Amino acid sequence: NRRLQQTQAQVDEVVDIMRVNVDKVLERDQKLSELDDRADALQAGASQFETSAAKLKRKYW
Amino acid sequence: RADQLADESLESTRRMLQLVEESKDAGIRTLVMLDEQGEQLDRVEEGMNHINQDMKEAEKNLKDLGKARENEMDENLEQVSGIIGNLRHMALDMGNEIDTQNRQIDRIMEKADSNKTRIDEANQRATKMLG
Amino acid sequence: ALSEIETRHSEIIKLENSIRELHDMFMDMAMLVESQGEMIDRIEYNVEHAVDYVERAVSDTKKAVK
Amino acid sequence: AEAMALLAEAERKVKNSQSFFSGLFGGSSKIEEACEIYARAANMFKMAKNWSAAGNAFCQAAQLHLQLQSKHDAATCFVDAGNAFKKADPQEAINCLMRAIEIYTDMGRFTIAAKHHISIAEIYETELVDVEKAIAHYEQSADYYKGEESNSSANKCLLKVAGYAAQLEQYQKAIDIYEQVGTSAMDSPLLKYSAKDYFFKAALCHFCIDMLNAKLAVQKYEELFPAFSDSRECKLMKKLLEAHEEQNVDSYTESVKEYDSISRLDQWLTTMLLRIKKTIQGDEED
Amino acid sequence: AEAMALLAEAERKVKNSQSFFSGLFGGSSKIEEACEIYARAANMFKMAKNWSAAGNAFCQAAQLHLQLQSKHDAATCFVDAGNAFKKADPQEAINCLMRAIEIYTDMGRFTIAAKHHISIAEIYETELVDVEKAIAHYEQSADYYKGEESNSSANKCLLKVAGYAAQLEQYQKAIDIYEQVGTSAMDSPLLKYSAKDYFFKAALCHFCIDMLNAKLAVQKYEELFPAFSDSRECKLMKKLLEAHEEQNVDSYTESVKEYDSISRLDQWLTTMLLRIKKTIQGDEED
Amino acid sequence: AEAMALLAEAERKVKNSQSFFSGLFGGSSKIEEACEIYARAANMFKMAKNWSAAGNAFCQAAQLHLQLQSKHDAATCFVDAGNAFKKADPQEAINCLMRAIEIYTDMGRFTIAAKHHISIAEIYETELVDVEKAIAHYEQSADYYKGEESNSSANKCLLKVAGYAAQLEQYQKAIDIYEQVGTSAMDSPLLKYSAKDYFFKAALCHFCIDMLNAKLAVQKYEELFPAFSDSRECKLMKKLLEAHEEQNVDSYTESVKEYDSISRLDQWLTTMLLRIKKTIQGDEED
Amino acid sequence: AEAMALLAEAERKVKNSQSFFSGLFGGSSKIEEACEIYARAANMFKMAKNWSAAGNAFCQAAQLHLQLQSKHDAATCFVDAGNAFKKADPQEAINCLMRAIEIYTDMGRFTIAAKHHISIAEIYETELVDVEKAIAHYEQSADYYKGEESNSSANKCLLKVAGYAAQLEQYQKAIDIYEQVGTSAMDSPLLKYSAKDYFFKAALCHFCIDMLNAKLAVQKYEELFPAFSDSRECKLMKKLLEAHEEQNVDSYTESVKEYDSISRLDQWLTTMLLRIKKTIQGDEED
């Protein structure tokens, strides 16, 4: 009886837990989304360095 | 209606289990990954650190070379309760994995950028001494 | 006593309600986390590999001065 | 470090050298120097929150970068320009992004091309209100995602396509999209979970058919009464089909009032449900 | 900008230089030029959705890359080609992947090798429908994962192995896997609750044993009454163990009908439960 | 091993060489060595639990790095210094970070500038109790995040701003912020459920108004009697609005007592609720 | 092709050159070459699941890698070796890891040092069963995490420290840790839910105290019965505190039985509750 009118909040409290769990994960998505455009773009420049460093090898070595 | 509610809602309490159980299943896949990924990022971070090192050397070289119905209805609640505790278990593992990685992303973004510059500067000094 | 049996139901449903929605979140959750999981599988790839591109560069540069 | 001053000097060096200036070598770096200048300008423009100017500045450094031979870091600049205009007060946010995708596409980066492609179709709708082109982008984009193994994203876009397709009268084409995204979801027993709503939407979408396309779509749907997820998809539908295949307009309008309890009706559902509530009435003095 | 033109130029340059054209220094740069060519072709073949051509093109640039001495970035191409062929219409999807693993595997890259190994066992099942070969891959791959202290991934694969192993006929070899994945799951309080289903599956799997392997496996399980997670595991099992030990195919099929209320059964369970149903009928008119 | 020895050699090497030491070139290679020295010292000073020493040491290596022209890695060093002083005993924790941002910002690095920007306002609040400067930072930082379209992050900061804005009597300026963060969080169905609390806070924050506003905002809010989550937002507010418009400091403090069961009141709520409870009395005894 | 062949070539080259063979530059290119060899061998060893050979091989390559002058890459190699040995046949898993941390720590890389430090203490317990050496690591590591302001991880370690500290009779040293990790958890409204269990553990850990060390800790605990989360914390405690202050090894042993219903007891609780169960009996007949 009372457990019903009581346990009701035993979940309304969790409904809040996940409310933050859903947000926490989503906050990481954007942090990893931007990191995906700066990390991949990073090695992209490394590719330019790999080609440049490779040529400096076929001339001075 | 009276009975169509004391039982229907009772079916909801029974269902209230799979509802909070399917959540665990959904949480497992998440945690299992958050953990798997956690270790991955460790080898991933090594990349930003590995490049951070080499670039320093690479830069130097480019510088050197450049110059009883209610009794059960009460039990189902206890069941939900026992599961609510679980929801806390995942909520913490998910939480501690999130906060620990977010700060990790910070370090990654930092070093990644720091190295990006060294690459650009080196790429502007190397491209000229091309061929 | 009726009054308690009816009031009971009222509180039970209000409870049943809040429940169903909390379940709605996990559904969307498993769809988000997974959609992000694939966004990292490529990261680990582009990372440990970028280590190869940089490693090959720093190596060639060294053998270009000695 | 004056902004407009940088914008001037940048112009002073962004030009093929000649005379004693050209000397012995050209200036493939000059153009790069100018790019760095305009970037330095857009920096302080973004500082004073003058975005507009920052965006127009990035457009310059970006355009110049192309005149140097460096599509990569160039396109990224176009992105910076787009982010600027977007958050800014003027437009141009659409042009920068198109000029970005042409690069990520020709170069060979469809992953990111689609990443910006969805942003595009999202702006061409929430802003310019040009769905006829937005859907086109949501679709081509989903195609790219569907080729990068990324199922989730692909479906993410498809949902947009069909979603706004039914809100434009394209009811049938919508159910079809829901069928495709429904088949390419069962292959993954981790999606079994969302695969309901699709059947609900598809069954709701009606191209004014006289047969039981919906009574059939709800049938194709595998469900078990004790189940829960399912009770949030077909159960209602059946009651709606009976209220429609039976020509009654109280039971439908009241069943939509009841379902609104266990499951809140979003914008979409509402609009369409009313369209059906009217197919009923429209059928009424007919 | 024509792929067909590039594919030709690439060929013209990809060949161990002969006569004067060779001199002393080989064509280690030429072979690379060709690789860049084919890559550009596969690229525009991917925007054209010609997939087949895109994949075969990447295969070319990749093979040549091997002929250049760069297994790393080569294998990477092999993967690109796999992603192409997969979401394409021809085959080669399985070949490219095997050709990718031989490289990640002999190069010192097992992490990613297993990443593609599971993809392989996934395609060889959802496409080629070759369960026996898929299991072999899911297994060898789980070995690598478990080596990278990625217990998490290891079990993700083991579950596949046992799962389809019970579907083929290997009920015993399935329970053994469930026992191992069960012992190496308690060491992580983050899988306690999930460790139930394992015991349920293992107890359901029967290799036609006459003893009480199941009545013993259910006993090995630790449950009480105030546990509600456990309610969806052994409690049912015992009822099934009694319905089997009493050759009553009416109490077993009734209990499965009841349990299918509080916990919806999935395809797997259904198939196996029916198998046990037939062993019983098959014990009655017996 | 010996930090007290390293610091000494450190200064003994960080100095523009001359005479025979300078020869033809000298500077960068040397000063960098000193930077590495001080970093090596600061590290053991960190294990030694001196902190102060570690922090000032990082400050040394950091300042030195600038004398070599390398603002990037330098600023990151300042971050190390900030982390030191932070979890240390002296101050300077704020200075290091200011010296970090002055670099990241001017460098065109707003993505990270905001990262340490929020850390800054966080220290300037939790420690220095300098709310007037903290808000300025939480805000400008949110503007940067909003530029990268990092919505969620920007909202995190905005929530900080408004949250601490209502505490500094700035009630109206708070509700406005809640309005903005509310209008830029509806298009995403992943923030639907959350948009509630926003309306609750905004309706609670009262700039001493004597009429609607809250009764108007509660209306602007979209709710349905069968709503579950909404029960934790306006349903309470209404009752509070009635207990306020009727200057009844008995029905307000009662309903808050009941609500403190279904949804416990956090410190914030309590503080503001008591403030409103007092405004009622300050209108009764007036 | 074979590893046995590679190990051989690697050995015949891993020899410091001298005399004429050394020439002007002996170079570390040789030692490095051998490192690459052994790495290539260790991997194929990891293919045939020879593990032992794989690990020892990695140890070789890493050891030489030290003779090369590149402590970093070497360290991570030692990690590879640890990854092999760990999930292998022989031991050395502990050695490699110690040999890795001695490098990360001295190199100034604590961030990663703690990452492997926790793995270490995690093996030194679940395997070597050397709690006294495990706790020392869980602790020092937590100190590093706390040094990197990484609160989350720091707490992850502290929980381990105190958790196993109570098992080693160290009860007071446990409660202190719970008190600290408890105070530094309230400042974060994202740990409120977990903060309970802390108080339960701390109130359970007893250093043979007879007073109200827990009866005071239960009061410090802000609770309101109709909260539930809290019900799974002090309720029982209160009932345990009465059963101890009355030398009742029946009310306490009954309370543990009843509480083991709504919330199951883990191995930790079981062991401690039994110790407390004995402190009562031994007090009765004394």
* Neighbour count for residue F101 (Cβ, 10 Å): 25
Find the CB nearest D228 among B18, B29, B128: B18
How far is residue D239 from each of residues B4, D249, D253, E277, F120, measured CA to CA in Å? 20, 12, 11, 36, 58
Chain A neighbours (≥3 Cβ pairs under 8 A) are: B, C, D, F, G
Judged by CB atoms closer than 8 Å, whether chains meet at G190 and B42 is answered as no
Residue of chain G with shortest Cα separation from C66: G25
Q: Which residues contact B80 (CB under 8 A, 6 or more apart)?
A: A7, A10, A11, B13, B16, B17, B20, E228
Looking at beta carbons, which pairs linking D257-261 to residues 24 or more positions away fall under 8 Å?
D260/F224, D260/F226, D261/C17, D261/F224, D261/F226
Q: Which DSSP symbol is given to G178?
A: H
How far is residue G53 from each of residues E150, G60, G64, G77, G98, measured CA to CA in Å? 21, 10, 16, 15, 20
* Neighbour count for residue G21 (Cβ, 10 Å): 9
Chain centre distance of CA E270: 22
> Are chains E and F in touch, 3+ Cβ pairs below 8 Å?
no
What does the alpha-carbon distance between residue E185 and residue G193 come to, in Å, rounded to a whole number?
A: 26
Residue G204 near residue G165, CB atoms below 8 Å:
no
What does the alpha-carbon distance between residue E263 and residue F157 come to, in Å, rounded to a whole number?
A: 43
> Are chains F and G in touch, 3+ Cβ pairs below 8 Å?
yes
What does the alpha-carbon distance between residue C43 and residue C33 come to, in Å, rounded to a whole number?
A: 15
- Please give the biggest Cα pair distance in chain D: 90
Tokens standing for residue F166: 């209502």
What does the alpha-carbon distance between residue E199 and residue E177 come to, in Å, rounded to a whole number?
A: 11
* Neighbour count for residue G129 (Cβ, 10 Å): 8
How far is residue E96 from each of residues B29, E105, E116, E130, measured CA to CA in Å? 29, 14, 11, 18
Residue G256, burial from CB neighbour count under 10 angstroms (0-12, 13-18, 19+): buried
What does the alpha-carbon distance between residue B78 and residue G23 come to, in Å, rounded to a whole number?
A: 81
Residues of chain A positioned with their CB less than 8 A from the CB of F264? 13
Judged by CB atoms closer than 8 Å, whether chains meet at B100 and G155 is answered as no
How far is residue B93 from each of residues G100, G191, G232, measured CA to CA in Å? 27, 11, 19
* Helices F93-106/F110-126 angle, 10° precision: 160
CA distance, residue C18 to nearest chain B CA (Å): 11
The angstrom resolution of this structure is 8.4
Using a CB–CB cut-off of 8 Å, the residues of F that contact B are 72-73, 76, 79, 109, 111-112, 115
Domain span at residue A24 reads: 1-61
What does the alpha-carbon distance between residue E142 and residue F33 come to, in Å, rounded to a whole number?
A: 47
Residue C38, burial from CB neighbour count under 10 angstroms (0-12, 13-18, 19+): middle
* Neighbour count for residue G54 (Cβ, 10 Å): 26
Chain B neighbours (≥3 Cβ pairs under 8 A) are: A, C, D, E, F, G
Residue of D28, D70, D73, D97 best to disrupt the A interface, most CBs of A under 10 A: D73
Tokens standing for residue G49: 């699941």
Tokens standing for residue G190: 């994202």
Q: Is the dihedral of CA F261, F267, F273, F277 positive or negative?
A: positive
Q: Which residues contact F19 (CB under 8 A, 6 or more apart)?
A: none
Residue F174 near residue F202, CB atoms below 8 Å:
yes
How far is residue D142 from each of residues D76, D162, E205, measured CA to CA in Å? 22, 12, 41
* Neighbour count for residue G285 (Cβ, 10 Å): 6
What does the alpha-carbon distance between residue D214 and residue D205 come to, in Å, rounded to a whole number?
A: 9
Residue E137 near residue G75, CB atoms below 8 Å:
no
CATH number of the domain enclosing A29: 1.20.5.110
| Angle, CA C26 vertex, CA C25 and CA C27 arms, to 5° | 90
What does the alpha-carbon distance between residue C58 and residue A58 come to, in Å, rounded to a whole number?
A: 14
Tokens standing for residue D236: 């209602």
What does the alpha-carbon distance between residue D188 and residue D152 come to, in Å, rounded to a whole number?
A: 11
What does the alpha-carbon distance between residue D74 and residue D68 come to, in Å, rounded to a whole number?
A: 10
Residue E238, burial from CB neighbour count under 10 angstroms (0-12, 13-18, 19+): middle
Tokens standing for residue E64: 């040549």
Mind spelling out the 3-state secondary structure of F41-56?
HHHHHHHCCCCHHHHH
Residue E239 near residue E255, CB atoms below 8 Å:
yes
- Please give the biggest Cα pair distance in chain B: 93
| Angle, CA G151 vertex, CA G150 and CA G154 arms, to 5° | 90
What does the alpha-carbon distance between residue G161 and residue G159 come to, in Å, rounded to a whole number?
A: 5
Matching residue, tokens 């083929």: E168
Give the N- to C-terminal CA distance of chain E in Å, as an integer.
Answer: 75
| Angle, CA E220 vertex, CA E216 and CA E224 arms, to 5° | 115
What does the alpha-carbon distance between residue D91 and residue D100 come to, in Å, rounded to a whole number?
A: 16
Q: Beta strands of B1-102 (E only): which ranges?
A: none
Using DSSP, state whether E161 is helix, strand or coil.
Answer: helix
- Please give the biggest Cα pair distance in chain E: 89
**Chain D interface includes C38 (CB < 8 A):** yes
Residues of chain F positioned with their CB less than 8 A from the CB of A39? none
What does the alpha-carbon distance between residue D64 and residue D14 come to, in Å, rounded to a whole number?
A: 8
What does the alpha-carbon distance between residue F263 and residue C18 come to, in Å, rounded to a whole number?
A: 12
Using DSSP, state whether F207 is helix, strand or coil.
Answer: coil
Residue F95, burial from CB neighbour count under 10 angstroms (0-12, 13-18, 19+): middle
Q: How many domains does chain A have?
A: 1
How far is residue E185 from each of residues B72, E166, E182, F42, measured CA to CA in Å? 32, 20, 5, 42
Q: Is the dihedral of CA E101, E107, E109, E112 positive or negative?
A: negative
Residue of chain C with shortest Cα separation from A5: C11
Q: Is the dihedral of CA G217, G219, G222, G224 positive or negative?
A: positive
* Helices D234-245/D251-262 angle, 10° precision: 170
Using DSSP, state whether A16 is helix, strand or coil.
Answer: helix
Residues of chain A positioned with their CB less than 8 A from the CB of F261? 9
Tokens standing for residue D106: 């020709």
What does the alpha-carbon distance between residue E250 and residue C11 come to, in Å, rounded to a whole number?
A: 40
User: Rg of chain A over CA atoms, in angstroms?
Assistant: 26
- Element (DSSP H or E) covering residue E250: none
Residue G126 near residue E187, CB atoms below 8 Å:
yes
DSSP class per residue in C2-52: -HHHHHHHHHHHHHHHHHHHHHHHHHHHHHHHHHHHHHHHHHHHHHHHHHH
Q: Which DSSP symbol is given to E261?
A: H
Residue E236 near residue E205, CB atoms below 8 Å:
no
Q: Which residues contact D133 (CB under 8 A, 6 or more apart)?
A: D121, D124
What does the alpha-carbon distance between residue B115 and residue G46 come to, in Å, rounded to a whole number?
A: 33
Residue G266, burial from CB neighbour count under 10 angstroms (0-12, 13-18, 19+): exposed
Closest CA to F162 of F188, F148, F180: F180
Residues of chain F positioned with their CB less than 8 A from the CB of A19? 193-194
Q: Which residues contact F135 (CB under 8 A, 6 or more apart)?
A: F121, F161, F164, F165, F168
> Are chains C and F in touch, 3+ Cβ pairs below 8 Å?
yes
* Neighbour count for residue F286 (Cβ, 10 Å): 6
